[model samples]
Target: VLRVCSDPGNMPFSERKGGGFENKIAQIVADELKVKLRYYWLTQGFVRNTCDLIIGTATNPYYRSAYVLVARKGELADLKRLDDPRLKDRQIGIIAGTPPSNRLSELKLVGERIHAYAPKHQTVAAEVIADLAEKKIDVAILWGPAAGWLAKQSGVPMDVVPLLHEPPPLTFRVSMGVENDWKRSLNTVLRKRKADIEAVLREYEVPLLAE
Candidate 1:
């Protein structure tokens, strides 16, 4: 059996119902192993793990998302590269405790003017873009896939700019906690399904970084 543990809400990732990319990828992995799949609900307040598999980005993420800059469309002044002087002028929203938080700190010192948005139960995309879309903030620094996906779904036009030159890189790597044998088997399955997994991510409008 392919046993997996994940949380219940959060879109583009995992949910109790269907349409989550993580759930889809897990199903694919289970099928690749030719085994029945079983899932146990993971609470956000939980402590240790007793399951053989802990999946999703919530607890030991099993995927990776590069960071990018999101802004309202029609006001583009070129934020394609990181450390741009123009970024200092606008009100930027950044998620706290994330990879980009540190670098943004330096920029904040230079008057980059970043607004901190902490993700507490709400998805990272939901929190970061909400303020930006409401015009409470001008730009948002977010994880690539969720940011890109949510920006479009925000019902307002937004620009997704890739930050390719940022130091200390802003990509998030997902992992699955499991036994040694299961981990090895999952790695092989991932290699075999790499293209399909990417296809699913792209279908969901996630930005793909070269590994």
Candidate 2:
């Protein structure tokens, strides 16, 4: 059994049941590979245990990680170097008690000047985008794929800024993690199946790093 652990909070929009895009890919991989897929839902500070695979944004400094970039539409052109004046006075939504919140706290902006909202990871994400579209919020900090999907389907016109900070401990990636001897095999699977996986991602209108 391939025990897959992830944050149930981020779905369809990011990759969850009925979301159709990422789930479909997972199903396909499972079916083709003949591996039984088991899901484990996680919350803030939930440490990964002995699972066959883990998928989500690996942002915490204590973990080996991959990273992706996401932002509000038209927010940043070059993720490697972000420059957005709108970030000032803009409410930046982040998951409370996570690295993002820590990063936000370290910013030079005044505390009152920064509007902070804490909600479940998924709900906060949708709310942040919705609030931004309603002009209720100024800026939101979110995972790349989820933020991109929301920007596309929310029917709210706004720019998404993708931030590509340095890898591991700082940035995050929606990744497939494994333990023990499965790493090489999983890596092979990832490389061999990347094209098909990416195609499904595109069908969901997920924004690639280049765009």
Candidate 3:
């Protein structure tokens, strides 16, 4: 069996209900290897060695994704980069400790108008999306997967634009974690199932970046 480690409550990525993209992709990998899929759910500390694979790990390269800028479609639909003049006075919401937060700080975008949401849970993006839906903030910078999936799921009619050319870099590569002995075999499976994995990501509305 393919033992996968994941967070049980991280929506659009991993969930206990098997509704997340990671779960789907894990099943795909297991099927590709002709093995049964089993999930070993945990909240944090994926390196505990309790499972054979952790589907999402930033320490290595798999596929690239980016942090995106989100706003209600009519308000900031044309906005893309952080250097735009339109963002000079807007009340922007950001998740605390994310890469975009550092860029925003360096850009002097921090002020009374800047809203920072602490990452208190696996699904904190849902809170950010909620505030955006209620117009609590003018715009939000968020991880692509969370922003893409939550915005669509919230029924908020928001525009999610992948951020580019900003300091501290907004894009990151996602990889699977497994033992060294299994790496070569797993990579082959990953390569063989790339399209299928991407299809699942697309279905979850993950904002991917070109390598």
Query: In every candidate, how many clashes are there?
Result: 4, 12, 0
Model 2 lDDT per residue over 165-211, tens place: 53215444455644445666665666677777777777665556531
Best-matching candidate per TM-score? 3
1 versus 3: better lDDT goes to: 3
lDDT of 2 at 200: 73
Model 3 TM-score, 2 decimals:
0.93
Q: For model 3, give the 10-residue run with minimal summed lDDT.
A: 54-63
- Which residue pairs in model 1 clash with each other? 61-174, 61-175, 62-175, 63-174
**lDDT per prediction?**
0.73, 0.54, 0.84
**lDDT of prediction 1:** 0.73
Ranking by TM-score: 3, 1, 2
- The TM-scores, one per candidate, come to 0.85, 0.68, 0.93
lDDT of candidate 1 at residue 102, scale 0 to 100: 76
- Report how far off residue 45 is in candidate 2 (Å): 4.7
**Cα lDDT for residue 201, model 1?**
83
Q: Higher TM-score: candidate 1 or 2?
A: 1
